[PDB]
């Protein structure tokens, strides 16, 4: 008996460092079941997609280092994916039905007995207020208002990498709780990329 801990996973911070490094373009215990607990009963022995709000193309449940803590981020993992098409002409079609069923499934998982509401990002940072992501040279900034309040269409801003069409599977989500009342308000999160990558490395350790 010795414990896993995805919230203090030094692996995450090592891979974080080197993805950052790469972005200047310009043994191991695996566990099977989980959630990053202490004891792991069954013991064996990576897309650096930069994105916010949503997780794309990953392992396919909700996890938080502390749910009582509104400041802590909620990583969400889906039992079924949702295909999202994105075009260089500047928008994203998305199945309205397929998307609506998803929110309410996440909504029952959140009730763990009260009202659940999803609202747009509180404001401030453009790469966070929008569902943003890179996609082969280009970088999309799409208003996800319609997403977080038979196709749904999302307007997109697009920048090529000048600083110094692609389809996708939606693996999961990043969420923030308004923790200040008989209502729990959830808004789209992101920013700390380490969360993207412990979303995937939850079931690993080093010893």
């Amino acid at each position: 008996t010795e414990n896993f801990n995805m919230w203090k996973n030094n692996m995450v911070e090592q891979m974080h460092e080197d993805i950052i490094s790469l972005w200047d373009q310009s043994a191991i215990l695996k566990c099977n079941d989980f959630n990053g607990t202490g004891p792991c009963t069954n013991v064996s022995t990576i897309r650096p997609v930069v994105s916010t709000q949503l997780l794309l193309n990953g392992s396919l449940v909700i996890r938080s280092e502390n749910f009582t803590n509104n400041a802590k981020t909620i990583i969400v993992q889906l039992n079924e994916s949702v295909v999202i098409n994105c075009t260089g002409a500047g928008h994203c079609n998305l199945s309205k039905t397929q998307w609506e069923n998803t929110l309410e499934q996440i909504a029952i998982k959140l009730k763990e007995n009260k009202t659940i509401i999803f609202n747009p990002s509180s404001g401030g940072d453009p790469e966070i207020v929008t569902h943003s992501f890179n996609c082969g040279g280009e970088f999309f900034y799409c208003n996800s208002t319609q997403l977080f309040t038979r196709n749904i269409t999302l307007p997109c801003r697009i920048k090529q990498i000048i600083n110094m069409r692609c389809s996708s599977n939606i693996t999961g989500l990043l969420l923030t709780r308004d923790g200040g009342n008989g209502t729990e308000i959830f808004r789209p999160g992101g920013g700390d990329m380490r969360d993207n990558w412990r979303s995937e490395l939850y079931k690993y350790k080093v010893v």
Partner: antibody, heavy 125, light 109 residues
Framework: QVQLQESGPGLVKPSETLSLTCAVS?????????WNWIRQSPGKGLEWIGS????????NFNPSLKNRVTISMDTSNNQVSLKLNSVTAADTAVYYCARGSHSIVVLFGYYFDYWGQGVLVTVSS | ALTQPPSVSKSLGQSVTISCSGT?????????VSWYQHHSDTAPRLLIY???KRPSGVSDRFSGSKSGNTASLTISGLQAEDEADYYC??????????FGGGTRLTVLG
């Protein structure tokens, strides 16, 4: 590349509203930059108050000033504004206006490359 | 905030290193550390951005590094024009931005 000039009342009474303005020349505030307010009180160090992002008007605040700060942008006149409510003498300070530049914020943040000269504001009776 | 020693003294010609100690949510979460020179009656001048990059033109004497939750600025061949206040700062998770407490550099000789 861009000039900034702060201005506003030099004296404010306690509990009243401090109001300042930055006039930006040489570029447009509707562009892809953060426009920041920063201050320094005599003896103390720098303190970020908040930012507004040109593209859509979204704001960020210092968590300990949030309850009494607003920031706006005037796209004609090309100006950014600070309103700080319910002041006290602890709000006496030099107020700076600064532009925030960035590559990808989620990996590299942003940084303050152009600053105005600052305007002194004194809270007193 | 982020912690720096309040004051350091060196001499003309020497090197100095100013440490900024931050947290897992600023310096350890981003390569977003910036350093600022501040002379009296002048606005703060950007020195280092994105841990180690420089604008033109701040000399080669200035350089920034990062280690875990701690960043550093080093100044070589101290000239008299370097007697200033020095500030480190960083973007921080939850869309906030935070400055260090400041280091007041004295240059002897």
């Amino acid at each position: 590349q861009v000039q900034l000039q702060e201005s506003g009342p030099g004296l404010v009474k306690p509990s009243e509203t401090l109001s300042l303005t930055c006039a930006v020349s040489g570029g447009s505030i509707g562009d892809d930059y953060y426009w920041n307010w920063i201050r320094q009180s005599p003896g103390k160090g720098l303190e970020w108050i908040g930012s507004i992002y040109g593209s859509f008007g979204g704001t960020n605040f210092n968590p300990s000033l949030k309850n009494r700060v607003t920031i706006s942008m005037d796209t004609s006149n090309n100006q950014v504004s600070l309103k700080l409510n319910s002041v006290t003498a602890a709000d006496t300070a030099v107020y700076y206006c600064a532009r925030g530049s960035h590559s990808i914020v989620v990996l590299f943040g942003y940084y303050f490359d152009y600053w105005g000269q600052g305007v002194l504001v004194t809270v007193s009776s | 905030a982020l912690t720096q020693p309040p004051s350091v003294s060196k001499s003309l010609g020497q090197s100095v290193t100013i440490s900024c100690s931050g947290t897992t949510n600023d310096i350890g979460a981003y390569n977003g550390v910036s350093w600022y020179q501040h002379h009296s009656d002048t606005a703060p001048r950007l020195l280092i951005y994105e841990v180690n990059k420089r604008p033109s033109g701040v000399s080669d004497r200035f350089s920034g590094s990062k280690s875990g939750n701690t960043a550093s600025l080093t100044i070589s061949g101290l000239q008299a024009e370097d007697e200033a206040d020095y500030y480190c700062g960083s973007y921080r998770s939850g869309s906030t931005w935070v400055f260090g407490g400041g280091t007041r550099l004295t240059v002897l000789g």
